[PDB]
């Protein structure tokens, strides 16, 4: 080899070797990820080098946690990572479609056909498939029922049936809570908090905030009914001069005076807070809660507790925005001009203690624009799985809200797209019809994998579904319980239109790029 001649320690695969290596890697990844697809898939267990246990069914998590050192595997992993980052779902389908596209392309390339014609057919079929997807999408007003259906179609695939049923209500309610009309949805306003004390079915939605820290002064109230929330970003602890001052005295009395005088700056802000609290509420019925992004020294904590004020220190940075949106106050970076109009309101604040960690609940807000999801489970791996599932559900519901259309699921859209591609194939000029046929066969992988996971046979189920679609013209998918064709739209099996479009685009692009690779080189040493 020329590269080996120039660099003796070089690994090179040329011509058919490159295609063989890439297709073998893609088919291996596809074989691993076949069992993930569908709610009837099998959970995979992941043990890290430190012994950490990870139960998951997501394609992206499995891809990241497989011990693989292959270039094509890295490429497919990057594609799936982009898929998950933008749309939040479809990674397993992405990998399956890439692998089946490469396999179908090889099926023709091994017979002497050049990959360029295959790529041209793939691209023409992709254009026609996008046209058909535009023609087939269902533009609907996203009410609560449709969002529940979408969240079900995601969570049931990701977790247990009853857990999915609970998480559907949780996710849909949270999205409806944080969403404003004709405004982009900010998923940063839903805080996903984990607790490890009860069962998985106890996961619920708190229309407020839950903080992973509590009051550090033992004498502060553990439960305040009517509270004025003062979110702030002001340091309430002792601060050192920036210019390296130090003190100089000549007697013990002077030292005492200097000690009493150096706390005046912080005590002024503490006094401002105390005076605001006194002015706002002149009785003991109402309460005052101070949430500070910076630390509070014990002296200020004692001074606040002597006035019946609950103070929380070292809050999260995003908690400022979350509290201002939920409670309704104004985040303050200084106390130069503090007025009652900048105080938030909470209908109930209380602290819950779990082992060595303490939590604070802020609920009963008048109209919380930011809410929190409390994940409860007996195990850490259960918490991680539920967090992944709720992330997928939130992404699916947000996509459904953004794109007013929705695509029928259960592989019905794939079957219809394959049928349309086969019908359109004669219009393609040249030998790119082979590439179009390969693209259609690759698109047909989703019903095949669904039937295989559900336990039925690929050929009989696929021919039954295709015959039903041809005879009726409806969008018939796969019934995972019986294997018969079924109208996915009627039963509520929905898929995200953006997810399908991204799948088509990314899969076609990466397959075309891989098919044109004729040499893998490693000569950087």
């Amino acid at each position: 080899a020329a590269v080996k001649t120039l660099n003796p320690k070089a690994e090179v695969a040329r011509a058919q070797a490159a295609l063989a290596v890439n297709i073998s890697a893609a088919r291996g990844l596809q074989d691993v990820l076949r069992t993930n697809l569908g709610p009837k898939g099998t959970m995979k267990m992941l043990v890290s080098g430190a012994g950490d246990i990870k139960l998951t069914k997501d394609g992206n998590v499995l891809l990241h946690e497989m011990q693989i050192q292959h270039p094509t595997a890295s490429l497919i992993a990057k594609v799936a990572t982009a898929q998950d980052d933008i749309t939040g779902d479809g990674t397993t389908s992405n990998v399956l479609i890439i692998g089946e596209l490469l396999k179908q392309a090889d099926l023709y390339i091994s017979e002497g056909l050049h990959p360029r014609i295959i790529t041209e057919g793939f691209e023409a079929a992709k254009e026609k498939a996008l046209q058909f997807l535009e023609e087939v999408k269902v533009s609907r007003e996203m009410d609560r029922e449709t969002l529940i259906d979408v969240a079900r179609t995601s969570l049931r695939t990701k977790v247990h049936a009853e857990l999915a049923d609970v998480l559907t209500e949780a996710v849909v309610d949270s999205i409806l809570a944080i969403k404003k009309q004709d405004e982009p949805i900010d998923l940063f306003m839903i805080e996903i908090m984990e607790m490890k004390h009860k069962s998985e079915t106890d996961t619920s939605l708190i229309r407020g905030l839950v903080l992973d820290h509590g009051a550090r002064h033992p004498d502060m109230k553990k439960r305040v009914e009517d509270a004025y929330i003062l979110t702030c970003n002001v340091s309430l602890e002792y601060e050192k001069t920036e210019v390296n001052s130090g003190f100089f005295y000549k007697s013990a009395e002077e030292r005492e005076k200097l000690v009493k005088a150096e706390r005046k700056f912080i005590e002024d802000r503490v006094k401002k807070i105390i005076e605001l609290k006194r002015k706002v509420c002149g009785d003991s019925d109402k309460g005052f809660v101070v949430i500070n992004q910076k630390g509070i020294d014990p002296f200020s904590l004692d001074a606040l507790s002597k006035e019946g004020i609950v103070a929380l220190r070292r809050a999260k940075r995003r908690n400022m925005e979350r509290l201002t949106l939920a409670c309704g106050g104004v985040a303050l970076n200084s106390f130069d001009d503090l007025s009652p109009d900048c105080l938030g309101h909470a209908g109930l604040v209380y602290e819950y203690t779990l082992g060595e960690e303490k939590f604070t609940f802020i609920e009963k807000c008048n109209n919380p624009r930011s809410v929190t999801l409390l994940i409860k489970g007996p195990n850490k791996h259960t918490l991680t799985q539920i967090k992944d599932a709720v992330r997928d559900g939130l992404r699916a519901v947000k996509n459904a809200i953004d794109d007013g259309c929705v695509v029928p699921g259960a592989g019905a859209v794939e079957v219809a797209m394959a049928e349309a591609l086969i019908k359109h194939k004669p219009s393609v000029k040249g030998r790119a019809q082979l590439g179009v046929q390969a693209f259609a066969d690759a698109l047909l992988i989703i019903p095949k994998v669904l039937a295989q996971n559900s336990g039925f046979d690929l050929q009989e189920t696929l021919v039954k579904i295709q015959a039903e679609h041809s005879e009726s013209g409806q969008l018939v998918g796969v019934d995972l319980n019986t294997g018969e064709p079924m109208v996915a739209a009627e039963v509520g099996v929905w898929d995200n239109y953006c997810v399908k479009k991204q799948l088509l685009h990314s899969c076609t692009v990466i397959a075309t790029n891989i098919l044109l690779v004729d040499e893998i080189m490693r000569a950087g040493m």
Partner: protein, 538 residues
């Protein structure tokens, strides 16, 4: 033709140290075998007749205990399915405080019976569905099996009788005495307010006189010594200071600037006079005992000794908070004299020696106080640790009783009744899930079987007798361990009762762990690493 190459695809793409297990035989059966092995390892310590286990951890620290949670914690468990079982047991311990061995036994029995069902031809989904249905049926049944309630928690003898069953499994020989001790300690705490705090019970371990010499003290005991000459106070007026017992200094930087001879002459005299004035001002309020969380200055100690003030230094902040709770004082941030509301009162504070240990005792005379301390005696550190574990179990049982007063019969009676009723329900269920329901019912047999095996009698005769007695219409009959021949007796009369909430949580957690283990079909383990622990675990 002398080597088998790796199959193309994932087999070759796998890393050099990684392992991949998939399918029934390679993954599910192996996990079930490992879980059964762990359950069999822990089984021998179940019940009052369970034997203690000598456990040596990686740090060569002795552990004698029949507590399942401690044994699991001090075993380097490597199989991850066993890890799930262990963490389910730990969750049961955290939520309730007892029943961990029940969790392991039930999970192991469920997994072996699931393996049998898979072998005979059932699918994993059918087994999981049957187990879930049977668990729901058992949870529905359990409230109907409640025999009696606590009906009183301020009483001493009744609470001791209730906790006797809880602490009879650990330290079977002498449980009446420990029951009385824990009952007194828990009744002193738990005031009219319904909340009960486990942390308010303190255990002090001083060896020398055997566990029969243990007692309960309405106060706190610190293994320290007084820093002053005064070592006994009869009308203590403790003033608690979080700051060190010394003149406070600037937090920026302290530099004594001297410009004249007079200042150099007078600086030390003024500092000493200020210290004397502060100490005398503290003493003038009547505070004859001073407790500080920091170091004690020499001049401050001298002036405290001059005014007859008892000095105790507590380095731990948790101990300072607990002392403040017990006495009723407030940890002052500065050295200012305390006002009457912040001045704590204790009926007797003195320095005493127990065995060969010098201790400081803050003793109340009333049968009240926020915190009560149990002083444990003994001849071995390991035995005293075991007694401490038994006391912890008793306190957790009392906390559960405060949470829920319902009780169920022990000694296998509840498990036998549950098995009988679940079998009866499953016999009326058409479909393939009847086998799974029947196996879930049969899994309850492992508790009385383990009890009979530990007691030294034949398990089959005991189980047959239990079925006969439950069939004839007696739901409160369990295994009688006080006999050389397999025999049964009513357990409501014997007072051998288990908390309903504990059984409910144990059943739920064991079923959840078994289902979670069964759901796993493929295992991908990375190459093991000998790293210096995760950063979170330090």
């Amino acid at each position: 033709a002398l080597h088998v190459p790796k199959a193309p695809g994932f087999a070759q793409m796998l890393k050099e140290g990684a392992k991949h297990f998939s399918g029934l035989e390679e993954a599910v059966y192996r996990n079930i075998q490992a879980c059964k092995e762990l359950a069999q390892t822990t089984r021998t310590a179940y019940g009052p007749n369970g034997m203690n286990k000598m456990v040596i951890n990686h740090l060569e620290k002795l552990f004698v205990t029949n507590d399942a949670a401690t044994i699991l914690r001090e075993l380097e468990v490597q199989h991850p399915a066993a890890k799930m079982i262990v963490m389910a047991s730990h969750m049961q311990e955290q939520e309730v405080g007892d029943g961990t061995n029940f969790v392991l036994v039930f999970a192991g029995a469920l997994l072996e019976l699931a393996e049998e069902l898979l072998r005979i031809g059932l699918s994993v989904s059918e087994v999981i569905e049957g187990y879930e249905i049977a668990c729901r049926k058992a949870h529905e049944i359990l409230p109907n099996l409640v025999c009696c309630s606590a009906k009183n928690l301020r009483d001493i003898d009744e609470v001791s009788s209730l906790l006797r069953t809880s602490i009879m499994s650990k330290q079977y020989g002498n449980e009446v005495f420990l029951a009385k001790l824990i009952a007194q300690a828990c009744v002193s705490i738990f005031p009219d307010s319904g909340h009960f705090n486990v942390d308010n019970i303190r255990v002090c371990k001083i060896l020398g006189s055997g566990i029969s010499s243990s007692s309960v003290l309405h106060g706190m005991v610190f293994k320290k010594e007084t820093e002053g000459d005064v070592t006994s106070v009869k009308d203590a007026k403790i003033a608690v200071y979080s700051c060190p017992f010394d003149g406070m200094i600037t937090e920026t930087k302290g530099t004594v600037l001297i410009k004249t001879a007079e200042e150099l002459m007078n600086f030390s005299k003024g500092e000493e006079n200020l210290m004397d004035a502060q100490v005398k001002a503290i003493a003038d309020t009547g505070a004859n005992v001073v407790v500080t969380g920091g170091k004690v200055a020499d001049m401050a100690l001298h002036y405290a000794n001059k005014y007859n003030i008892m000095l105790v230094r507590l380095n731990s902040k948790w101990d300072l908070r607990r002392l403040c709770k017990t006495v009723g004082a407030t940890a002052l941030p500065r050295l200012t004299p305390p006002v009457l509301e912040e001045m704590g009162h204790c009926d007797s504070v003195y320095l005493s020696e127990v065995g060969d240990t010098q201790v400081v005792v803050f003793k109340h005379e009333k049968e009240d106080g926020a915190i009560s301390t149990i002083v444990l005696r003994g001849s071995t550190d390991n035995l005293m640790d075991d007694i401490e574990r038994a006391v912890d179990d008793g306190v957790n049982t009392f906390k559960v009783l405060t949470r829920d007063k319902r009780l169920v019969p022990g000694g296998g009676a509840t498990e036998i009744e549950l098995a009988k009723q679940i079998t009866s329900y499953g016999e009326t269920c058409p479909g393939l899930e009847q086998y799974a329901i029947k196996k879930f019912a049969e899994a309850f047999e492992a508790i009385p079987r383990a009890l009979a095996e530990n007691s030294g009698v034949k398990a089959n005769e005991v189980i047959s007798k239990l079925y006969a007695v439950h069939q004839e219409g007696n739901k409160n009959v369990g295994l009688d361990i006080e006999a050389e021949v397999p025999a049964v007796k009513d357990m409501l009369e014997a007072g051998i009762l288990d908390t309903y909430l504990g059984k409910y949580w144990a059943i739920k957690l064991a079923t959840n762990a078994a289902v979670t283990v069964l759901r796993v079909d493929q295992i991908i383990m990375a190459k093991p690493a000998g790293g210096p622990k995760p950063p979170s675990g330090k």
